[PDB]
Amino acid sequence: PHNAIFVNFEDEEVPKQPLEAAAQTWRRVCTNPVDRKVEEELRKLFDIRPIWSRNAVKANISVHPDKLKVLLPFIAYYMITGPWRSLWIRFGYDPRKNPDAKIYQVLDFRIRKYKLKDSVYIFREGALPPYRQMFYQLCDLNVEELQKIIHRNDGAENSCTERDGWCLPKTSDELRDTMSLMIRQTIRS
């Protein structure tokens, strides 16, 4: 598609290098020095945080979308199934072999110049998700209770499953109910 590798949760190995088509496409698109600058910036940010969401990345650098859709498959690979679905992972990083990746797992919450804001990917007591269906990452839930629910099983993550990953079972529903309660609390205030 965009010269990206799509990894399933049941795939044995994860890619350790991009595709040569993606490398040549980036070589073609990289025209101004600002492109090299933003490439280095994205590389450093994926070095600090190995797993990223597109909206979270857009909230950290101001890049042109047509440049980002080419740069991302060159730096990271895309997850299709599993606890880290719809997330970009640095080449050579396997979340199914790192318990710390628990803090990078995804959570789908449905209600019932180029840089973006913080509310597009960060949850806080007193704010309101800007969209009807969001894909948060467990590290960006800046609440003490949600983080306690997340780290309840720290140091003894047992096995990595598809429904919950390194987290304890039925954790996602617990976080979802807590965020709904906090949303109603913020609405009342």
Residue 71, CB half-sphere, CA atoms under 13 Å: how many?
A: 24
* Helix (H), strand (E), coil (C) string for 71-134: HHHHHEEEECCCCCCCCEEECCCCHHHCHHHHHHCEEEEECCCCCCCCCCCCECCCCCCCCCEE
Count structural domains, the chain.
2
Determine the structural domain holding residue 66 and report its residue range: 6-95
Q: What's the DSSP call for residue 140? A: G
Same domain, 75 and 114: no
Same domain, 56 and 112: no
Q: For residue 82, what are its two tokens?
A: 């599993």
- Number of helices (H), then strands (E), in the chain: 6, 6
SS3 52: strand
Sign of CA dihedral 154, 172, 188, 132: positive
Same domain, 90 and 106: no
Same domain, 104 and 184: yes
Helix (H) / strand (E) element for 135: namely strand 133-137
On whether residue 122 sits in a domain, the answer given is yes
Contacts of 8 (CB under 8 A, 6+ apart): 80, 81, 82
User: Can you tell me the distance from the alpha carbon of 83 to that of 160, in angstroms, rounded to the nearest whole number?
Assistant: 9
The torsion of the CA quartet 124, 127, 131, 134, rounded to 10 degrees, works out to: 10
Sign of CA dihedral 13, 69, 50, 18: positive
User: Can you tell me the distance from the alpha carbon of 82 to that of 185, in angstroms, rounded to the nearest whole number?
Assistant: 32
Same domain, 81 and 30: yes
Question: Are 120 and 59 a contacting pair, CB within 8 Å?
Answer: yes
Question: Are 99 and 91 a contacting pair, CB within 8 Å?
Answer: no
Comparing CA positions, the residue from 80, 79, 94 lying closest to residue 166 is: 94
On whether residue 29 sits in a domain, the answer given is yes
On whether residue 70 sits in a domain, the answer given is yes
- What is the CA angle 57-104-77, rounded to 5? 60
User: Can you tell me the distance from the alpha carbon of 74 to that of 4, in angstroms, rounded to the nearest whole number?
Assistant: 8
User: Can you tell me the distance from the alpha carbon of 102 to that of 84, in angstroms, rounded to the nearest whole number?
Assistant: 9
SS3 136: strand
First to last CA, the chain: 46
Same domain, 57 and 72: yes
Give the end of a domain, one of 72, 95, 118.
95
On whether residue 1 sits in a domain, the answer given is no
Q: For residue 5, what are its two tokens?
A: 């590798």
- What is the CA angle 148-52-13, rounded to 5? 100
Give the end of a domain, one of 95, 122, 155.
95
Same domain, 101 and 71: no
Same domain, 122 and 150: yes
Give the end of a domain, one of 62, 95, 128.
95
Resolution, angstroms, 1 dp? 2.6
User: What's the one-letter identity of residue 103?
Assistant: I
Same domain, 114 and 166: yes
Same domain, 55 and 114: no
